[model samples]
Target chain A: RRWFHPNITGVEAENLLLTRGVDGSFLARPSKSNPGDFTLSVRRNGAVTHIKIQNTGDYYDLYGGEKFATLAELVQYYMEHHGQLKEKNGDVIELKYPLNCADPTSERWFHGHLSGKEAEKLLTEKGKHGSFLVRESQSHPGDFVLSVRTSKVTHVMIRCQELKYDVGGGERFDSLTDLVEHYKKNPMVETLGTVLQLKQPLNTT
Target chain B: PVIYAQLDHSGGHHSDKINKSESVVYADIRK
Candidate 1:
């Protein structure tokens, strides 16, 4: 019998990238369009780089009825009300601003690369306020250029072997524009499709 | 590994919602 070892090495893990509110709430929000829950995370280097966001409910009542919208809207809204675009190590990082729900609260956004000691300290000191946890670390592969300006995500380029798999699956805008404009389009479908199609060709065989 | 090439859209909204979207051209020799 022949043995086949598919090279899953370069694949990016979806679970690795997580999004959470400054209040330690996962980026998840409920949607009437899709059953269960909708979650989101940013992927980098074949792994999820930030907090894993599991949708709990909609951003507001309006979103509950609007499932056709793109995921970028939720991300942009989170960034607008509670996110900060910062340049970290030359890569544009969307640092969700600390949330101040009702009263001022302190929630530390968790990511990989933090030493156990640092993570422990952050948990001990800040975890009490509630910290975002990294759950479901998986692997995926692809290259996307994300840029932020003035606390808004200004540019996002999804480059890959498959062109149809572009962000929001082309439902959203094609080029990067102002953060708000980009958010309105919400290109989550395109982004997710890119990652999914990457494995399809290999898996079909 | 099999490789295929596709066009890169510079601007304008292209409906990626096409059926069996050809945007992804598969070139797997095994297939």
Candidate 2:
């Protein structure tokens, strides 16, 4: 109930609000597609009106039709109306699966290849253990290296596994690209096999 | 922040609508 404010950023709570039949203060839940915390409808004097979003400056809800009758209708309005969700970084993404993290339009939910800065901002955890990151390789076409956060650190992937180097048997690389350069030159290695598949977000620190 | 991936194109081709790439998950190229 308290999440009904100017700005609330809790992930799980937001999802719960959106999920059907979970009794909260009001059925009207907030959404990322919306500019403010919650978009809703209210009735008074035997008349109903869509909740007008005010005070939240500049961030506009592109799907705010301003004429919804119920919270259920409001939720469906989000799914049915908007074809896009603009990110804070200015990327306009098509919404294929409105309820999903994003459209499963790709090989997976999210594409991992991005410049380090973009990746840092997008992958805020830095694609940490139990996470994912992409490294581009010429060999795999548009399909780049999607490595797991655990399993092996980037350096160890180079020193021991990929490049087959022996960094005193320790893990950790200065940079992923640094390792790629060596492998590109050597070209042939006994240990280098199909390291292209998905890494289980299994394994712990 | 959650990042999404997905989408394409050609050279010297012309039309009212053209292929807008980068929409889906790209497979691993082993970078």
Candidate 3:
């Protein structure tokens, strides 16, 4: 949800988009030249492109495109509809990957945007059980996926509710770190009634 | 999202898929 980075400059945005993002990776940030407006920076073919996002007091839009109430809504629209955004010369600027902002917490266990497949590889790399890490769910926005290597990596959905965190049921924790700590101390029982223990976590350093 | 309560014993086959896909992503960055 925090693809809009307010503190970074255009150069920093390009650095992040090119270094961290794939071809379709993108991010939005405050425009420097025009104080009130914003810019949509995208990574295309290993290079970064900066597109202007006009923000009037009334609405936000891509310069002169479909206007929306908020900047997030306009971005969401372009993300879902790939064909809507294209270059003047017919080059399609697909906003497939979102270069999400850094985790609010400084914890090593928060792997941010690592997908399920990537999480499994990192968790099972050492072939150790109870090894776990928290990452943003690729499928479920605003929610997180806890990948625990128990025999095999089990992706447990961690729901984000009104700032509180929980698994599917039972107790709720205040923070993601708290949730992980709670489970580590108290083993989680799988739906099949398997007592899945949380062992040493595979921290992302 | 559905909670995967069952044992994911798909083993090596599943791991291979991750390797092929993620390895390239990491490789691209090395350059």
Candidate 4:
């Protein structure tokens, strides 16, 4: 039921949406004087267009109406309805899940630490869309979370088959990392051609 | 919310098609 990881940052989530070309829907209010940065504004949906950007942060809320979740969760839901997301043009955008999508295809596998910006770039390039094992922090104890992106949504698996698991619907990960951690830890389950068992101990030194 | 599961009148994963016209006969599986 917990379809979100507490640690997934805003940038990490939006980056995934960009990969699907759905990022165009959410227009950014250019900072008065900034290029690499812009004030996060509203999404492209006409319904959501009514939701104004009172503050220019990654998260937003309305007066007793709808409140936005982390950018990760918000973006993920937009794409969850369709296995893919629709561009503002009303055309659908469907990218081929790379061969290593559900496996240890990414060399950026995190046993340690990686920046949010760095992760967004790497995962996007790897053509990833699932649960990825990652240590949550380098400054604190041995923290780990499934840095997940399902249909571009974010979640953290705190357990194996228990409540924390997010299976999406039937196909890919509701949070891609959930699939990687689930298939890897379970017994009866086997990895599919699109997914892999990538050696366990997904978290360590 | 989202439809997590679905059960037909026969209590099956999918419907056996009782009427016609590709009509579906099922209830929320999560219920």
Candidate 5:
């Protein structure tokens, strides 16, 4: 479960925080010179770590333009009077009562974990979340894919359930090595999705 | 909007040229 992509440059795993808005869209906030109203959480040693990015005056001016004096002022105002911002691992930011701040619906928030090879297959399948695919040559060989949904935190999961004719199986595991071993042991499995289900049980079941 | 269109076209052209340069040697999917 490595955080940073091997190929993307200037990406420090420690400096990167996974953020979510009240509506549940996920965002990756890279440490910048100016901060915003978003807070993020990281999991380490079975404990949840919190990182708060304060909205600085400079960032507000950049985002809000002439209307707002500074990013920090606007964010502070929002935090104190509008939405109830909380830092939690995989938790949603809740809004305070009577504060009718509309939920941010931009898809620039969420990301997925499909590598270049997986992304290629996903594009062929016409699957969703393929739009976030970014190819990086400096770090890793495969393209890094991300998804932008709402502003809430999310943990994206990729499941494989198909198999080749030479193998027999159901849903497969997350690890390629485990999938290969299962394929070797069972030659009747047909689809990667089925193999994934066998390796990991779906919540529906 | 007019300025945006010009800027967009220029950016697209630049990206296309860079992609083409890389595509000539290998797959263009990297761009």
Candidate 6:
């Protein structure tokens, strides 16, 4: 749902996708030409492709060939079923990544794409013991980094594998939010005897 | 509590038409 940008024009969509996205990266926005209809803006071969998503009163579809209950479902199907979406020339338009729009929640600590250096600096400068924040792992594309201040800044990598989130071992959760909430009660332990207390979250605001 | 990890390119096997080198996730642990 974060991939859906409701307030951008086709011009703006192109700029965002081209600048911020890689090949197969995409975003969904309302179509300018068809008012109620939506456009799936995707980055392909260093360019942007605008695919019209028709909302024919009840269901959402690429053009009535494949229908979905919601826009997310339509996008989900295309992403999961890789070779399904194509052009008239039979060129497959892959929907590999999403050009995300916002933070997943209003939790303040979930910094979307902040770097490790910045996370360390932020935690050290503005936080105390147990002060933590979660950010997208720049190294591991689908993973997350939980930065906390204990003796020093400790970064724990949360792996997003098989549609589940875990800290390499131990319990796996359905979502990053669930993972963080669980860690709040249970302190994360390091082999070096460092205890990561997930206490007050360092607000980015 | 709800938080999204954005689009996951980790799963699925791509067709031969799609290039696997570009957005493919490597085994890097953390950043």
Best by DockQ: 6
lDDT of 5 by residue, A1-205 (tens): 1222222111232233222122222122223333223333333333323333344532322122122332223233433542233322333242221212121121222122333343344333433321222222111112121211112111112232232111112363554335334533542211222111122111110
Worst 10 residues of 4 chain A by lDDT: A95-104
lDDT values of the candidates?
0.26, 0.31, 0.69, 0.30, 0.26, 0.72
Q: How do the residues A1-205 of candidate 4 rate in per-residue lDDT, one tens digit apiece?
A: 1122232223432443344323234322222323222233222322112112222243332211122433223333333534223333454332222111122223344433343344444445543545354533211112233443334323232222222333323334433355555556641121321332234332332
Model 5 error, position A70 (Å):
40
What DockQ does each candidate score versus the true complex, computed on alpha carbons?
Answer: 0.02, 0.03, 0.02, 0.02, 0.01, 0.06
Across residues B5-31, which tens digit of lDDT does each residue of candidate 6 receive? 122222344332211111212122221
Structural similarity to truth (TM-score) of each candidate: 0.18, 0.18, 0.51, 0.22, 0.18, 0.49
For candidate 4, the docking band is incorrect
* Candidate 6 chain A lowest-lDDT run of ten: A63-72
- lDDT at residue B10 of model 1 (Cα atoms): 32
Candidate 3 Cα outliers beyond 4 Å, as residue runs:
A1-84, A87-102, B1-31
Model 1 stretches astray by more than 4 angstroms: A1-25, A29-68, A82-205, B1-31
Per-chain TM-score of chain A in candidate 3 equals 0.56
Error of 6 at A197 (Å): 0.6
Best by the TM-score measure: 3
What is the TM-score (0 to 1) of candidate 6?
Answer: 0.49
The residue-by-residue lDDT of candidate 1 on A85-187, one tens digit each, is: 2222344334243211121111112132222233334444433322222111111112232222211112233332222223323443332223223433442
lDDT of model 2 at position A105: 25
True contacts kept of each: 0.00, 0.00, 0.01, 0.00, 0.00, 0.00
Which TM-score does chain B of candidate 2 obtain? 0.18
Candidate closer to the true structure by TM-score (higher is better), 2 or 6: 6
Model 6: residue A118 alpha-carbon error in angstroms = 0.3
